[PDB]
Nucleic acid binder design. Structure first.
Length: 93
RNA sequence: UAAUGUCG
């Protein structure tokens, strides 16, 4: 039919600690399905983390299960938030 | 929960 939203197999993440790395999100997101890419962009002004990230699955049903089994979770002693990404020109086609 | 998806 079509994509679940303005994006496909992508998940926004927030509430992360400044110590969280792409290996932490990979270890947290892998049991729900095959991960295909991960992003943790720094502030682009001071080279520091902002407590948010993105994760991307090989399948869309794995991203839906990840929303259903990782939202409101807790990483590094802080509560996280997880959902599909907001509308914007994505790096993908 | 919000992005300049550290340019691949």
């Amino acid at each position: 039919a079509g994509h679940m939203a303005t994006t496909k197999r992508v998940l926004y993440v927030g509430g992360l600690a400044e110590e969280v790395d792409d290996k932490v999100l990979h270890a947290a997101f892998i049991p729900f399905g095959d991960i295909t890419d991960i992003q943790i962009p720094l502030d682009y002004e001071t080279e520091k983390h902002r407590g948010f990230a993105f994760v991307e699955f090989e399948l869309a049903e794995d991203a839906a299960a990840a929303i259903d089994n990782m939202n409101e979770s807790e990483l590094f002693g802080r509560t996280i938030r997880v959902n599909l990404a907001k509308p914007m020109r994505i790096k993908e086609g």
